[PDB]
């Protein structure tokens, strides 16, 4: 059973750090995709390449 909203960010040493930096990474990646979504056809040219 996992508590609602528990991402294990604040517990122990390595696993906690890993989860923090991971959610951080995924967030940066949502901003990344949400950033490239603004441009519909540069990565398309790259794709055809």
């Amino acid at each position: 059973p996992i508590a609602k909203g528990d991402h294990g960010e604040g517990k122990k040493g390595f696993f906690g750090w890993f989860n923090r930096m991971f959610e951080k990474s995924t967030h940066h990646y949502t901003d990344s995709v949400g950033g490239i979504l603004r441009s519909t056809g540069r990565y398309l040219v790259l794709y055809l390449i």
Side-chain angles (χ1 to χ4, degrees):
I2 291 299
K4 189 175 187 176
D6 187 20
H7 296 276
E9 308 184 22
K11 42 205 61 177
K12 70 188 307 174
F14 178 61
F15 275 160
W17 147 263
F18 187 72
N19 295 19
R20 300 179 200 118
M21 75 89 53
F22 178 70
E23 290 286 348
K24 173 176 178 292
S25 310
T26 65
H27 216 185
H28 266 180
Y29 166 78
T30 56
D31 299 321
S32 303
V33 174
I36 71 176
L37 275 162
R38 308 170 301 180
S39 61
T40 41
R42 199 177 66 176
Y43 299 94
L44 268 57
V45 177
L46 174 63
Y47 168 75
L48 286 182
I49 291 179

